[PDB]
């Protein structure tokens, strides 16, 4: 018992707080409570950007927490919350996990140092691009992509796949974002 | 800082039901697996019951199932043990311990059944 | 359902000497052991538990060591205030199997 462990986290709703809660009580219920004590709290969304580092830093890390979870708010803005939480643990090394965000700059381990999250990016399913072209008989691509992060490493990831059979696309043409 | 005071003593013919108690004190009361054993003179120490109080889950020794019914009650923490009926050959002490490592234990109760 | 042995039963030792108490399983538990300490007209209370682990408060005199079978706890400088019935017991299968030991008894030597 002495040992106390200060697990935080950052959700979305203040229901899934609750969820949140008896989730940890789980993990005390049926693993011991000795060397561990696992001891949940959490904060809710901050709509003014800076304020998100502002709370994070003086709630979260005035509690010595051992590793931040983060998800996406109600209202989807595609990056919002990852990007400040990221970067303020992040100077300390303080390893976060995400719950939602598929997107792929994420997983880059030199702008976003410690980040592990548990779906895969939308670059990732470039295999299956691969896997189901491999078996209805066909070796042609047109493929276009957008000019983003995410297009780009879309189409190096699926080049760089493809080129193992000895083959490439026939046009990678791309055009750019936001295009009327 | 954990106190584990039990009840006091107790002796009872035959037939009738028991009631002890082991209310704890000093640590969040729904976090732990509070348990039992019992000691007969000069044998050893056995398993007889383990409860978590945050969801009244229960289980139970090889053999004792459906002789003792083990509870429990959040607002003083009291983890009792219900007995059954008759058992007259129960003379022994009873311990309640607290964390499947059993850790801070408690006075002894001793519980007589004669004649 | 794990038998427990616990050998040998009267132990004695002169005020200053050691001892090597043993107790072997029925099994392959790997680590999931713990010792007691009893003195007469008392509750137990805990002193070792991971077979190789101290609890809080317990001074240095106590230690033990082993795995898969053959536990052994060693008192180094055994002082006057001891001398009481000692049990070992091991928790696998948790919560179900609590099965305990019946343990060895020191006896000081004057």
């Known amino acids: 018992d002495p040992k106390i462990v200060n697990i935080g986290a950052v959700l979305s709703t203040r229901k899934h707080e609750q969820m949140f809660r008896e989730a940890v009580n789980q993990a005390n219920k049926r693993h011991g409570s000795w060397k561990i004590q696992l001891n949940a709290t959490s904060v809710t969304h901050k709509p003014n950007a800076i304020q998100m580092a502002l709370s994070v830093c003086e709630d979260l890390i005035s509690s010595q927490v051992y590793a931040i979870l983060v998800s996406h708010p109600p209202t989807p803005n595609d990056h919002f919350t990852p990007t400040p939480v990221s970067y303020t643990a992040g100077f300390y090394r303080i390893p976060v996990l995400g719950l939602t965000t598929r997107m792929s700059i994420y997983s880059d381990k030199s702008i976003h140092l410690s980040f592990l999250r548990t779906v895969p990016p939308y670059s990732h399913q470039s295999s299956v691009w691969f896997e189901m072209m491999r078996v209805y008989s066909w070796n042609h691509i047109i493929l276009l992509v957008s000019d983003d992060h995410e297009g780009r490493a879309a189409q190096k990831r699926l080049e760089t796949l493809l080129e193992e059979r000895e083959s490439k696309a026939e046009k990678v043409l791309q055009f750019d974002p936001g295009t009327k | 800082q954990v106190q584990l005071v039990q009840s006091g003593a107790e002796a009872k013919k035959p037939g009738e039901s028991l009631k002890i108690s082991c209310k704890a004190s000093g640590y969040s009361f729904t976090t732990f697996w509070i348990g039992w054993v019992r000691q007969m003179p000069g044998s050893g120490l056995e398993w007889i019951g383990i409860?978590?109080?945050?969801?009244?889950?229960?289980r139970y020794s090889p053999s004792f199932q459906g002789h003792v019914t083990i509870s429990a009650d959040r607002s003083t923490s009291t983890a009792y043990l219900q007995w059954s009926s008759l058992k007259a050959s129960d003379t022994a002490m009873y311990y309640c311990?607290?964390?499947?490592?059993?850790?801070?234990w408690g006075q002894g109760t001793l519980v007589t059944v004669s004649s | 359902e794990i038998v427990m042995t616990q050998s040998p039963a009267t132990l004695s030792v002169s005020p200053g000497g050691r001892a090597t108490l043993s107790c072997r399983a029925s099994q392959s538990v790997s680590s999931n052991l713990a010792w007691y300490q009893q003195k007469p007209g008392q509750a137990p209370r805990l002193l070792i538990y991971?077979?190789?682990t101290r609890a809080t408060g317990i001074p240095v005199r106590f230690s033990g060591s082993g795995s898969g079978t053959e536990f052994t706890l060693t008192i180094s400088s055994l002082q006057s205030e001891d001398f009481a019935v000692y049990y070992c017991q091991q928790y696998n299968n948790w919560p179900t199997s609590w099965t305990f030991g019946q343990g060895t008894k020191v006896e000081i030597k004057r």
């Open positions: 991971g077979a190789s």
């Open positions: 409860i978590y109080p945050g969801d009244s889950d229960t």
């Open positions: 311990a607290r964390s499947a490592v059993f850790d801070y």
